[PDB]
Amino acid sequence: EEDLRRRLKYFFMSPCDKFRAKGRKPCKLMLQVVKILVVTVQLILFGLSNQLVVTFREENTIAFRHLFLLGYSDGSDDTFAAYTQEQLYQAIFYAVDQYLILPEISLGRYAYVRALALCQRYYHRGHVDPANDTFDIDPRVVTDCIQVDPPSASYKNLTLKFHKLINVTIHFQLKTINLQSLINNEIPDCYTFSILITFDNKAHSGRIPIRLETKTHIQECKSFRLLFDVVVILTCSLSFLLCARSLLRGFLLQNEFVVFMWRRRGREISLWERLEFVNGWYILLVTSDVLTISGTVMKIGIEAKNLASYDVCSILLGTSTLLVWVGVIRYLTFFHKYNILIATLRVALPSVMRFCCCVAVIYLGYCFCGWIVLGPYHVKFRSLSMVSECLFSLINGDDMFVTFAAMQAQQGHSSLVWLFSQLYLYSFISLFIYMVLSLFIALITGAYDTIKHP
Amino acid sequence: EEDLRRRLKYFFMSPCDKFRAKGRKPCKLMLQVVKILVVTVQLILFGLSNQLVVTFREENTIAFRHLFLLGYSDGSDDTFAAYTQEQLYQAIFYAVDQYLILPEISLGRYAYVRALALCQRYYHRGHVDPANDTFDIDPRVVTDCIQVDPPSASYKNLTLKFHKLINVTIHFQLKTINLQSLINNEIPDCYTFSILITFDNKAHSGRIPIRLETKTHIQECKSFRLLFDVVVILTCSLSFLLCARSLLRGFLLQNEFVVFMWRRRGREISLWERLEFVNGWYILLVTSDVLTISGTVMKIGIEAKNLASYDVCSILLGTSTLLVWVGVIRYLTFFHKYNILIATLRVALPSVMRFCCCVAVIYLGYCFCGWIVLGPYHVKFRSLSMVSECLFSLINGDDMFVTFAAMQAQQGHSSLVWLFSQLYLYSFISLFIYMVLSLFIALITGAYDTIKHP
Amino acid sequence: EEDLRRRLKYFFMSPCDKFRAKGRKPCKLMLQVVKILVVTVQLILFGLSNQLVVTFREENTIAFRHLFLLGYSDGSDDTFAAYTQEQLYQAIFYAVDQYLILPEISLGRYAYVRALALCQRYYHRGHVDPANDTFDIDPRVVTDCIQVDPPSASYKNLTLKFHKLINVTIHFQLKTINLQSLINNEIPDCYTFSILITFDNKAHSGRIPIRLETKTHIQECKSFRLLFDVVVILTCSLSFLLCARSLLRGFLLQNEFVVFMWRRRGREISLWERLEFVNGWYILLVTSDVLTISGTVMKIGIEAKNLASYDVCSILLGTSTLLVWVGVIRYLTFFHKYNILIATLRVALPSVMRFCCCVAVIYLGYCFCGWIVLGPYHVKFRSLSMVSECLFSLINGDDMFVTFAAMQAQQGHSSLVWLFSQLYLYSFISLFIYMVLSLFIALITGAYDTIKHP
Amino acid sequence: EEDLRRRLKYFFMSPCDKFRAKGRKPCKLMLQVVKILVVTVQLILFGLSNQLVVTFREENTIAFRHLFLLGYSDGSDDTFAAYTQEQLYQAIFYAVDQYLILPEISLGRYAYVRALALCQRYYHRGHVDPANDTFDIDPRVVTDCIQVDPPSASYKNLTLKFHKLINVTIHFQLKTINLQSLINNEIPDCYTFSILITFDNKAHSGRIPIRLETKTHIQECKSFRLLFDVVVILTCSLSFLLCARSLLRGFLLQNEFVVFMWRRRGREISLWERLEFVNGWYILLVTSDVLTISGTVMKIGIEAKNLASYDVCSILLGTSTLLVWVGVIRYLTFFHKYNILIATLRVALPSVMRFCCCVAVIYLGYCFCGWIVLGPYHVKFRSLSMVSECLFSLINGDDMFVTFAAMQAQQGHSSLVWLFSQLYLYSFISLFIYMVLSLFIALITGAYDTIKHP
Ligand SMILES: *[C@@H]1O[C@H](CO)[C@@H](O[C@@H]2O[C@H](CO)[C@@H](O)[C@H](O)[C@H]2NC(C)=O)[C@H](O)[C@H]1NC(C)=O
Ligand SMILES: *[C@@H]1O[C@H](CO)[C@@H](O[C@@H]2O[C@H](CO)[C@@H](O)[C@H](O)[C@H]2NC(C)=O)[C@H](O)[C@H]1NC(C)=O
Ligand SMILES: *[C@@H]1O[C@H](CO)[C@@H](O[C@@H]2O[C@H](CO)[C@@H](O)[C@H](O)[C@H]2NC(C)=O)[C@H](O)[C@H]1NC(C)=O
Ligand SMILES: *[C@@H]1O[C@H](CO)[C@@H](O[C@@H]2O[C@H](CO)[C@@H](O)[C@H](O)[C@H]2NC(C)=O)[C@H](O)[C@H]1NC(C)=O
Ligand code: NA
Fold first, then answer.
1. How many Å apart are CA B148 and CA B98, to the nearest integer?
2. Is C200 helix (H, G, I), strand (E, B) or coil?
């Protein structure tokens, strides 16, 4: 009788009450504090390594734009184009000539890689004739390359085909050595820059945009942190073991209560009792455990095998650290102790969540109105997604006088879309500022009263 | 006695309670779910058709600006003008010369349409003489055209009349073929671009702005969705039939109660009883029915007859989809069941709506103060409507440091409008942020308490 | 006994109750409705007259900038300067040469006014010698003019004195005729443009800014609204008579109650009874009366005598219309009737107003901290007033990422102002968003509960 | 018995009640009012002295940029660079040639200081060879100067070493005389401008940025306020004496109560009684005392010894004035009198402060997610601090449509970071606008109810 009662009472005993009664079982909570310190120190010490890499890439791409592009100002990337015929010839010829004299010009020690390959791509047999609308078009793509070697009569006399042109692309490589890595007490890693100038002509609209994308391949030239990540996986795995034993002990006393409620037979106490046995935090911490050790094993594999995709490793570690810090709030809820602190998902959280569904639908309806009506006349409403970004910017207010001014400029001079757009925007702003934010305050205040005073 | 009572009770029976008692009358609610899916799939599949058209127009207008306008940078449309005399001559002569050599320049396959017509418009007899203020002006407009044919001594030697000039306009057509429509598994539609360069001289202020408007006419050259819109009109019309029978059955039991309250004679129960009989949602859904089928019949007529005005069809379909999604909230109010959920328009909604009138008037008064006082000194307050956009931007905060800086620049150096403008703007911001948003929260919270706890 | 009681009861009788009992005393309330219509129609019909004038001025100033200034792009007014020596000579010589050939260049019919007067202003005897710090300076200003007549050897060979130069100013006039005023069914008013180019050298810092201010003088060349303003002053004056009789009748029954409370002798009922006798709205309406008729008499005097100062007339009419529209709320408070609706200034309004004093002081303290500390390092914090505009923009959020970026750029590289500026800005934003807006909601909600439920 | 009781009652007696009973003890409160006036008049009269200095510096730096830098537009400081080889030579040679003819060019009376010293800094023995990855690098820095004297064959023929270059710096001085200080009734202070042009090549990335920093040294050439600061330190020190006696008298009656509660022996009344004896404001005012007199003694020392570091003096005075104005609120709490008005730090302030900890952690977790994941692809997320500025700007809404557009531009075209970034940003905006601001309102309203109605 007595032993079965106190095991439940020891189970829901707060650890601050449990230290002042039992005395010194420290090894559980200490490694949670160690986990927060060790994971964030790994994340910061990795993040500075990326920033030292990335800005060395970002300055080199800009220095390639001022060298290989013709007439490139700064901050005008997307509206950079070649409209006439001679501008396309001049933008090709200037890009090659700046390659063949590159050691006599640039300032970083750029070396060649043994070369440059110009290549255009036109249709197999295209005949566009707008006087008779005759087309006889195989959409088969025939790529016609041309080679240029650096230390010409072969390079010039080039004939583009402006009536079936798809792409004019230039591809080459460059190798450079980081010299910042002298003082940083490391072996300077040699980089390989792979450049692909693109003269895109997909839309065939008499406007060819131009862009220049780079790509790196970091390789060591002609042991601290390697120990540190082993520290992280051992620390985090011991938490994965120990918390799993805590939850299955929670299942042990989950079933131990119910069997005792058959000899008593208290009407087979429902699902809202067995759910009151487990926890509200250890599932969050153990989900952080699996995410952390998965990202770190991927991080160990990268820096020996290949260093290209710092992408899935980044999206896993950045979520693991988020779950750790949000997992610290438990320490600030030992002071609270309302006796389950999980019935909020029965009581208060449903009445805010179906309101969140009601807000989500009305917001979706104004998306589907704005994208079709104010699509062809306005510049910021092309895709459905950019409509979603523009209306969600209008809620808090970021982009709001620019859209009324752009609406005021012409808007067709139809004076029906404009009378629609005033009635559209004023209603949508005045709805989600006043009659939605205020309902949301009334719901959360009703929740907080319902949790506290009962 | 019993049959008349239960017909009322079956009427207000919720459908989730009605399935668990009666059993399987599914055909009503199912087509509402089908309606939401079918209307939104029509709207999305139409909207992508517009975006593939519109961006092909928008790139071609920009490529016409870089070809036919002199000295056109990008993003400087409105402050593009010709101030001297030679700039107006050079902007005309350059626009014609780029037309007569257009196949040797541009990149899209632009073909002529058999031509270019330059034409100026000056007054019949105007004599402006500022030394004696003598005017003898017939405002009769005499248009003097001139023809130019492309494959000149006729084109040059042109004499403008800068003392009675109204407009110098150039009009011509261009025909091109979309070549993007090869891979999209369709017949490539040939377009016809109609260009109208405008040298406007309306205000006679020594500043002539320049702009270039295009206009398209899409025509097929030398059956999926056509079935799909027939699916929409049949689906939506069956809802228009079936919901109308539901509401007139609502009128049937509207009158059936009142006649039974004459044999009882319960003091001839008032308008707030017969209004409690109908609904709060089927009028919204049937208004979506009429709007949907009207827009679709207009959409069928467009793609065979003429394709110019995608304007009223767009403004009807974009409203119909809005009413559908806002009409989904009924499914989230079966869980609620407060026994009419329409008396809010008697109880709670009036006490927010007359407050909304009180906010609307004060906002209108600050419009009429700002437009006359801060009109002549500030750039953003010309019309009354742009004042309305500027103050409504200042409420949420979008344009707020720019207007104080523009106020700080000169503001006449009268130092009376500036002392007014500080007292104007600070009071208007501090009113509608604090003492209006907070009253609105107190009203909605009082509404939600009044609906719930009584 | 009975007659003295009902005169009080008729006094506080609402007019909607007073029509349904007494019957048809309409002439009081009708002219209030007439007042709202007539004043706003005057204000709108005057405001369109200003906008037709002002944009004709604003385009002519821009067309003067492109003609008389050297190398003027658009939207770069304040950072337009002449730094070297030859740039100051070239900006003078170009401005005069464009004046002497002005009818052969510009497009509006600009005529001369019989002329141009160049004039510089230098000190009487200034000797600046930085090798010995010797100054012997009379600050007496000696103006040296030079005349130029238009249809030169006299104009050139000009010698500026760059070691004691204060101002180089050019002044002349231009006359033009509005030709837009043909179709507008009026007599076209001839304008006189007075231009003053300024080469300011006040700060002696090796940077001379340049600006060009115009000034107009509208005069008729070689009766609807005149009646309409007489309609306004007669309408508004009859309200000034009739409401004054209403308030002095309010003083009549103010004293009639108190004398009857000496025969009763109800302990000499206090100031919060005699204040409950008058009103809360007629003082607002009669203040709108005096402001309206004052501005209109000034408006009559302007359009015959001189048309320069549309400034005090504008600041009076724009306030009168504001008081009228805010004065409409009384019609929406007949429905309310809480029996004085002025004791809010005893009950609820003091407890928000001393909180408004407490917010006003803390805001003032952060002004005096920011202007001295973040003054010399940051560009937006020069005056105290521009600090007030910048912090008040940071409250609602308009200018907030720009100031952190400007703080991040250098900020001295002292790393003490930066550590101060992070702690400054984060505390000031987080205070007035959370812990002030929320107290203000709690005060207004406490006010609304106190007014309603007691 | 009686004397011990009334000393406590006189202690908590409000001064407005204390004047109407005792009568005229004015000297305490009067100097607090004098303190507010005297400190703010010192602060304003000092702040205008800084602004007259700083704008004379800020215009001279800009006028040095247009003279000594090649091809400098305005507002383009950070993206000003030299990418090729000839641009670095031309930017050096142009900067020196504009120095050797400086009195024949500039407008302010700039004089030389007897000179210019060009000097480059390259590595001791560097060999970068990307064909074999051979490096043999001493990172020892060998500075190679070159002298130029102004009134050349020595200046030209300069050989940079582009393969081991670190810095190319030019240093010289200029002396000028303020001439604005004639009319300001003072002795004109001669300034010394020290200029350091920097051609930084730290990252070795083929992109050399260019910047020009100045530095002043104000010295008088060949008594009002000096008295005024002595007034401030004497005023503020008398407050430091008098308030200290008030607090130690507070300790005197702190111990006088407790000894009387041993003869009574009221169970040794706890820490929440002895804390109710002192104050809540005099510690704030005396902290303002020490800060004020410290900053002023530093201010006296500056204007005789050296005038460089107006930095710690500014950061102390700007905090002292803040504490004074926030210290005025006590006058508005004599009207209040809730009988301690400090138990809020026991009652209400803890339940908002641990919520402020819970908000602070979640905000920190989204920092550590955003900086690693959205680091390499986005321009505004480089450091951790600029992530903190960007997310805190997104809360109130300042930078919100720019970040979605920059996310929409490429974002790698990996379509996994983009699907992450939508889910990242939408959750973070919707959390701290709705479900945090509303909890904060519910906490402050619960605080205000708890303070008032109990
Ligand atoms: C230039 O256009 C060609 C098509 O003419 C592109 O080649 C295709 O690219 C897509 C995506 O990489 C592939 O799915 C196709 O298989 C490619 N087809 C052929 C025949 O190569 C080419 O990628 C374009 N250039 C760039 C830089 O995008
Ligand atoms: C150029 O000015 C002429 C007037 O001189 C405009 O012609 C008028 O245009 C309006 C609107 O289209 C019509 O209501 C009038 O009937 C037209 N009058 C004549 C005589 O044609 C012309 O439209 C202007 N050009 C442009 C491009 O707007
Ligand atoms: C150019 O500088 C002169 C001073 O050298 C200015 O003349 C003074 O202007 C102020 C304000 O108008 C008057 O209070 C003084 O009496 C004027 N003094 C003299 C001697 O004229 C002149 O105004 C400046 N030019 C401009 C356009 O502001
Ligand atoms: C140019 O580069 C040199 C290094 O080659 C810089 O000199 C160092 O500057 C730092 C910071 O001032 C000192 O800690 C080092 O002791 C300096 N080393 C030497 C050898 O001087 C120099 O400061 C750079 N120029 C500028 C303007 O920053
Ligand atoms: Na902005």
1. 13
2. strand
> How far are the Cα atoms of A388, D77, D409 from residue D416, in angstroms, in the given order?
19, 36, 14
- Output the residue whose Cα is nearest ligand 1's atom 6: A167
- Are the CB atoms for D275 and C378 separated by under 8 Å? no
Which helix or strand (DSSP H or E) is residue D319 part of? helix D312-326
Interface contact A416-B111, CB threshold 8 A: no
Residues whose CB falls within 8 Å of the CB of residue A436, separated by 6 or more in sequence, listed in order: A359
User: What is the Cα–Cα distance from D397 to D437, expressed in whole angstroms?
Assistant: 14
- Would you say the CB of residue C141 lies under 6 angstroms from ligand 3? yes
Q: Is the CB of C198 under 6 A from ligand 3?
A: yes
For D435, the closest chain A residue by CA position comes to: A444
Name the residue at shortest CA distance from atom 20 of ligand 4: D141
3-state secondary structure labels for all residues of A313-378: HHHHHHHHHHHHHHCCHHHHCCCCCCCCCCHHHCCCHHHHHHHHHHHHHHHHHHHHHHHHHCCCCC
Amino acid identity of B92? Answer: I
Q: Is B198 in the pocket of ligand 2 (CB under 6 A)?
A: yes
Which D residues, 294 through 313, put their C-beta within 8 Å of a C-beta on chain C?
A: 310-312
Q: Tell me the Ramachandran region of residue C161: left when phi exceeds 0, alpha when psi lies from -120 to 50, beta otherwise.
A: beta
Q: Which residue has the tokens 């009857």?
A: C260
Burial class (CB in 10 A: 0-12, 13-18, 19+), D338: exposed
Buried (b) or exposed (e) across B147-178, using 16+ Cβ within 10 A? ebeeeeeebeeeebebbbbbbbbbebbbbbbb
Report d(CA D43, CA D317) in Å as an integer.
7
| D435 three-class SS | coil
Instruction: Check if A121 has its Cβ closer than 6 Å to any atom of ligand 1.
Output: yes
State the Cα–Cα distance between residues D198 and D95, nearest whole angstrom: 11
Cβ distance of A50 and D375 shorter than 8 Å: yes
Tell me the DSSP string of B182-229: TTTTSPPPEEEEEEEEEEE-SS-SS-EEEEEE-----B-----HHHHH
Give the nearest ligand 2 atom to B143 CA.
Answer: 20
Phi and psi, residue C348, nearest 5° = -95, -45
CB pair distance less than 8 Å for A311 and D414: yes
D373/A328 touch (CB, cutoff 8 Å), yes or no? no
Tell me the shortest Cα–Cα distance from B185 to chain A, in angstroms. 11
Spatial contact of C355 and C443, defined as CB atoms under 8 Å apart: yes
Handedness of CA D255, D257, D261, D267 (dihedral sign): negative
Cβ-Cβ contacts under 8 Å for A75 (sequence gap 6 or more): D79
Q: Which of D368, D399, D413 should one mutate to test binding to chain A, selecting the residue with the greatest count of A CBs within 10 A? A: D368
- Which residue shows structure tokens 């015959």? C304
Q: Is the CB of C119 under 6 A from ligand 3?
A: no
For residue D202, give every residue at least 6 positions away whose Cβ sits within 8 Å of its Cβ, in sequence order, or none: A180, D166
Backbone angles phi, psi at C147, to 5 degrees: -100, 145
Report CA-CA distances (Å) from A434 to B436, B444, C344, D63, D398.
10, 9, 25, 51, 20
In this structure, are residues C216 and C192 in contact, taking their beta carbons and an 8 Å threshold? yes
Q: Does residue D87's CB lie within 6 angstroms of at least one atom of ligand 4?
A: no
Resolution (A): 3.8
3-state secondary structure of C208: strand
- Chain A with chain D: Cβ pairs closer than 8 A: 185
| Buried b or exposed e, range B388-417, using 16+ CB within 10 angstroms | bbbbbbbbbbbbbbbbbeebeeebeeeeeb
| Contact (CB<8Å) A366/B322 | yes
Instruction: Residue window 82-141, chain C: list those with CB within 8 Å of chain B.
Output: 104-111
Sign of CA dihedral C214, C216, C221, C225: positive
